[PDB]
């Protein structure tokens, strides 16, 4: 799978592919890996259980309501329980989340990571996306969305675990 | 073992083989891997331990009266307990479950997948069935049962762990 | 990779995909895996080194020159050296070969194999192709070419090591 | 795969199944695992690679004329070359060979075994066949062929690597 | 070890050998592996701890008293706790149990399995017994007891972990 | 290590890094991984042992005069000797070689690959370079050298086994 | 370590060696592996950790006053706690225990074994002692102590983990 | 298997069992493991291939023809080639040989070994036989033959790879 | 990662790199691995998970107000909870902590080490930093910061898991 | 072991320790690892067999006799045979060699390597020496000899496989 | 096994034990591990296979006349042939050889070590002997033989693979 988040000219996005793999074969080819949150104010993507999602994203939503839209904090409070709560622990995944404020990754380890330029690329195709994204972001005037897209394709082209079904979620602000 | 589920015009099925393997020998040939649940309004097939399935399915019923029979919603709860709970957490199984609204997989990884056309193929012979089920569903006017059956047999021919004993539960909602 | 060969109504074919994989990434996406031999009378497909090919196919040609078009024999004489000659031994591959006479697989083990219905499906995507080919061949009037094609796609859809680039070599005779 | 050889009243047989397994999938179902050698005066069955068996049986014939058809004496030599020689030493196979004088196994370890009553059962399903073959040969007046066949099927039901396709070469010397 | 249960002409039995092995040597050669239960109305055999037995068989006895001789049910209720009760869980074994009603196996997994013809053959020698039992049961008029016996010998003859000390428990009803 | 080759407008390059890793430590940082061969008409880069590459490139030159500088044809032969020959067969290396006619990989598996646009990226950082190289070559008017260099650096940032020391051999045929 | 127990005419013994091994070196040579329990009416030997044995034996006593000294019955309870209980479950040891009614092994697998003639031989040198103990007990009028001792020494000669330091506890009930 | 050789009162013997094992099942139960050589003057036993035997024993005979009955030397000269001659090397076995002069073991390693008291016990059952042989030899007036026998039985009782079929070769001289 | 701590004349520092590695790729380059604790009177660096460190450091503060800021004494308590407590026990990290009284390591093994001269070097690049830090501290009048920095860079050059991004916290007590 | 070579102010050196290790213990503590060659003009150090040395150093000498003092070339010509000659191949070691011209490493791989600043540090203690050598070389006016020495000590202090016995070979020229 | 060599006042020895271990059992106790070579002017001991040692010592003698009995020079050659030659290269052994000029180890790695005071201790019990041998040679006026013997016994007490059977060859040159 491949999750790519970019941010340029008052525009932030998260894009993902839809391949779920089991062994050496494709189980499903259109898995929605990028949803929306906090009253369609906060976008996100992720790699993992379709249920682990529906549990981590709900909690995260409430964590914001307990920290007035302050993405970071709620994000900080999220990864917190995620490594503390006996049950919540078994949950495995990689949340990529971004609002107008900023964007970041969250690992079961409880880490809240802010990548070099809000550039995010998690998943087995992550680095190929990163490379292509970085390339575009430094040598062209393309848009945050055009980046993730093109970068995602590049990935799905290299990654045997990434396909060409996309699910993009933008966000404008300036 | 191979569990196959096809769905065509108010007709959804679930077919399974009946082999139980121990090491390299066949322990049982007529294992019933498909059954009805929730006042017959729900069909289900399972890969793995019988008693484990009995456990998981029973609880599934429980969750259905809890959510007025809403498959998914009632099913996601099960995708929960299964990984969160101490005991269930131990159970090893793959669930295929369908009703008139949709078909879907349920795994102990808190994952609830609903493949491309409600087409489901799980178990070691899973892909082979999917392969055949796909070809048929797209080049013939054959029905769900006809496909499920024909597909299951193809699986049984390829898969060393799937035999030709069948059990099919159908659901007509037309 | 996935090589599929079919034979129906005085028509035989060999179709292959074009993905070459290294680890978890695609090295090349358009590898020609199906050629032609013996003055464009004999068709073949293969899984392996581009050189192993241009060596095992050249030889095979000469073996036919030593056995008047008689496929099988040159094929037998081929797998013969392929398991004896000190050097030729290190060569690794899976040749699928078919003439108007018949079709068959050759392994470095020296085996000459004629599958059930001149139906061939080698490579990691082999069985998924077989499953879909078999389905079609038994439930529809489609053509040998149409089979291999459709079958190949089905494969590339399931197999993480098989793509959708094709290379088909037909043959007519009646 | 299972190779079985029963011997009763001037009637000696060798029955094998026809499954060839690759990983967990059936590659071929009609593999011929039994054949005649030395002007039909000798019958044989084999576990393993066909081309390897062909090679070994060829040499075995060689040794027979080389010893006036004396099974054992000609068979021990083969046990010799097999372990010693560079190439042959590589061949992976198990041999079951019979004539009117006796039945016997031949392995790459330069071992030439002749079981309790010329009762031979080699291959993954070997024992199960032996079990049934024993029971029959000691509680029924059934014939060699009848036992071999019945035993082989029992094997095919137990052994996940043995199917129900048969090839039986018989020999009458009565 | 080898446990064999058969059922013919209003007669059901369970027979076992007495070898306990530790590594590559015999610890004991006369282990009683087939006892009686529920006021000598229910017979059984088993593979495992001499204590695990004395705990599982006692419980099972009470489970019958809580389900009026209804073998199956008590059996169902048994395998239940066996995979639920924290303590009872560590118990490893394979109970074979049979009454006039029917016969079945119980695994730590909680499964209650009824084999094809009440034919039961658990333990490392299981399949060899099965093969010989099946053979006899289909080609001779021998008795349920004569079967298990002969079948058990066949096993102990093939199985390096099975000897020739028997412990048979019959049961008549018609 | 990363070797990258881009090709644009009569300009073809090959850029490599210069890190040599031993275990988890950097042994050398200025390894020259690219060089010229065949009267400067041919440029090459290599992953692996320097002495091995020197040996292989030497022979490659040999094959070139032996085939009037026809890359491929002279390159396939090398693919030959490499897998066959006793000594060469031992050499561990990956070759990237280009001239004005085409770019192509050369592996010890007697494989001669020529990627989608003569775009080559081998070595542990290979894909990442490919990713960025792809993105650039499709969204900017940058040159081969500009891409190769920029791609190589991206690789050097991602790949823990690739540094930022470069060596670039260019070729202009325009 | 080797614990041996022979029993002849109102004379039952238990002899053990005294080596404690760590890796390939001898840590202690005079380990006391045999001792008296329950007002001297009971002798015992143990393979494994001293403190673990002290723990297990103490509890064993406890169980004896609980069941009026009935060895077996009181011993089976111990075969219980040992595998059911959290703490004990961790203890690693093999118990040899005898009184005037019988001798018997006790393992953490809820197993209580009473070998052929009350002859017990446990520990890495166990078999060798059994072998010798058997020969002597069946071809000489020697006594328990004489056998146990002579057997233990034979063990000490064969077994690299058994030395010649002894500790014997005898019980005369004649 | 188990080979036991003893020597007492101008009598030397070699006794062996007849079990050949493959995995966890018995292939044959009456293998002759003790022969006779040098015009029935020299006795021997062995563990290994029936061919390795009929090659290492034939040679040994000729080595004696080259060293006037002098056992030891031919034995030395034997183990000599057995570790040098390119071919003879692959041979695997354990020859036990004894004449009126002395007795000794020979290993493919080329070693010639004379055990403590001409007492030999090779094979997986070796030590158990040694333990019992030693016991008898030191505490009873039994005969060399009686020893090997009784010892062999003791072995077959402990060793899962040793049965109770014997083959003894005595020798008288005084 | 490399954490280095040098201490010279009322000047104690702690420098860390900023690379976070996943597999063989760099996930983040500016990780802050050093920070202040306990009203800035205490500096600290950490190898491992950020959130884990946040957890451990916070508790460390807790322990300081508990022991009036006595580093060691307050630190030993932490060396406790860390291995005794259920949750903390799971945290994976290496702590480097200094104040004006002393520097010291803290590991989850209930270990509190204070190296030779308060010189600390932990993390995969640890030794290399120690090596350089040692040389400098003993052949130059350079300061703590100067050494820490220069040492860290040397580490960053040798260690494949350490980059050149720094974060230094100094403490002047002179 | 640890070999360190440095070059400063018309002075070059090679210094080594003297520990030879086998498992976890020291075999010898004063191994001479630095010699002299080519009529005491060329210095060298090495890691490996005392014989491999007295063979690779003798040869190297002759290679210089075949290339008028020209270090590099004889060095190239050396690593040449060292990777070709059937025998010489099995030789294992790491020669460090340096003349007034230059210094460099030679590996059985046939590589000739000239490190950054004629700075060499091979052996398990290699990097620690490099780190300390580099530090000194860049922050002090110390001499080549003084460097190698101090560096070597630093190594032996960190490296469990390096001691404090030295063997230095200097060289003056200007 | 332990081989020890002490040297004092024109008296040099070599003492070995006599245990041969197979798995965890003692195969022989009186193995002669020390002997004389070269007209008794040379004494040697060896760890490993007797036949291998015999072979190596034979060649060693060969080299001695070939070098006028110069230990080292004749010994290095042996270190040569040993690693280079096809057959010898297979031999698994460790050599301890002494004469009046010096003592020294000889390994298959073409290594010829001569410990600190001609003190040699090889074999699994090697170090322990070295330890005691060192202590004695530095706090007592005891002789070579006295130390060797006393050291060997200490080894025999510690090392599970060393017994107390000795063989000592001494040499007086005073």
From Swiss-Prot, chains A, B, C, D, E, F, G, H, I, J, K:
Active site, renumbered: 1
Residues the entry annotates as binding Na(+): 156, 159, 162
EC number: 3.4.25.2
Compartment(s): Cytoplasm
Phosphoprotein keyword on record: no
Pfam families (alphabetical): Proteasome
GO annotation, cellular component aspect: cytoplasm; cytosol; HslUV protease complex; proteasome core complex
Major enzyme class: hydrolase
GO terms of molecular function: ATP binding; identical protein binding; magnesium ion binding; protein domain specific binding; threonine-type endopeptidase activity
Triggers of expression: By heat shock.
Temperature curve summary: Optimum temperature is 55 degrees Celsius.
Main subcellular localisation: cytoplasm
Catalytic activity: ATP-dependent cleavage of peptide bonds with broad specificity
Any one GO biological process: response to heat
Regulation: Allosterically activated by HslU binding.
CDD domains hit by this protein: protease_HslV
Family, similarity comment: Belongs to the peptidase T1B family. HslV subfamily.
Full protein name: ATP-dependent protease subunit HslV
Organism for this UniProt entry: Escherichia coli (strain K12)
